[PDB]
C-alpha cells in the first residue's frame, strides 16, 4: 500500500476521484472504496514487478517518490478507457519510465522518512575466498 485514498484525493482532488470511481450513479455521489483499493493494488503490483530485482518486496516503509508513482498509476488505472493522447496516459508513461530507470540502476530509490531502503543481496555473492598461507601462521 504505497498510496491511500487520502493521497489520491490530495493529488487529484476529491471531485475527480468521485467522478472516475462512481460507476453506478449518474451524476456521481460517493467514492467507491473497493474500486480505488483495486486500482492501488494494481499500481503496487506493477511497481513491485519493476522493483523486485533490486530491493526486498515487503517494504517496511514507502519512499515519497514511490508514493507519487503509485498515485499516478492508480489514477491511470481508474479509467476504463484510456486513449494514447490522454494526458493522464502520458503521466503514467513518464512514471513507468522513472520505474524502469530505477530498475536499470540509473536512479536510486530515495529516503523513506530518514533511513535508506533495503537493497537485496544480489551483488553481495562471492564464492568464499580460499587464502590459506596468509593467516599469520
Amino acid at each position: 500500500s504505497y498510496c491511500t485514498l487520502a493521497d489520491l484525493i490530495e493529488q487529484y482532488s476529491e471531485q475527480k476521484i468521485r467522478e472516475v470511481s462512481d460507476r453506478v450513479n449518474k451524476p456521481a455521489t460517493t467514492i467507491d472504496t473497493v474500486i480505488v483499493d483495486r486500482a492501488i493494488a494494481d499500481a503496487d503490483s506493477e511497481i513491485d514487478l519493476h522493483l523486485h530485482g533490486r530491493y526486498q518486496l515487503p517494504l517496511a516503509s514507502v519512499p515519497t517518490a514511490l508514493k507519487r508513482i503509485a498515485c499516478g498509476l492508480a489514477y491511470a488505472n481508474l479509467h476504463i478507457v484510456l486513449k494514447e493522447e490522454n494526458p493522464v496516459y502520458k503521466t503514467a508513461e513518464h512514471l513507468r519510465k522513472l520505474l524502469s530507470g530505477i530498475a536499470n540502476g540509473k536512479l536510486s530509490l530515495a529516503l523513506d522518512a530518514d533511513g535508506k531502503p533495503a537493497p537485496v543481496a544480489n551483488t553481495v555473492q562471492i564464492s568464499e575466498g580460499r587464502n590459506d598461507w596468509g593467516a599469520d601462521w
Binding site: D132, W133, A135, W137
Partner: protein, 102 residues
C-alpha cells in the same frame, strides 16, 4: 642408586609402571595431519610448547607415514647407525675388577 642419585627400590621393578594405567593401552591415534592448514599447524606447535605433546606426537607420526621422501631419509639415517659394530670398554686405566665387570 641410579646415575642421577635418586633412591632405587627393587620392589617396584616387578611390574611395569604403566601396568596400572590400562586406559592408555586402549587409545587410538587421532590423525591430526588430515585436513591440516598452516594455522592448525601453528596452533599444534604452540600448544606442544606448553606441554600438550599428544597432538604433536600424532602429527609427527602422520608426517612420517605420509611423506615418502622424508621417510626414506629418516630410515636411511637410522639404518646408518643400526649397522655399526659396538663394544663395551672399561673406564680410563681400569683395574682388574673393573675390567671383569666390563
Amino acid at each position: 642408586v641410579d646415575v642421577y642419585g635418586n633412591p632405587i627400590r627393587t620392589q617396584q621393578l616387578r611390574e611395569p609402571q604403566t601396568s596400572r594405567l590400562a586406559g592408555l593401552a586402549k587409545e587410538f591415534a587421532q590423525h591430526p595431519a588430515k585436513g591440516l592448514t598452516p594455522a592448525k599447524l601453528a596452533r599444534i606447535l604452540v600448544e606442544a610448547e606448553q606441554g600438550n605433546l599428544q597432538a604433536q606426537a600424532e602429527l609427527f607420526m602422520d608426517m612420517e607415514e605420509r611423506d615418502a621422501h622424508l621417510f626414506a631419509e629418516m630410515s636411511k639415517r637410522k639404518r646408518a647407525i643400526l649397522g655399526l659394530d659396538w663394544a663395551v670398554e672399561p673406564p680410563r686405566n681400569a683395574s682388574a675388577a673393573e675390567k671383569a665387570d666390563a
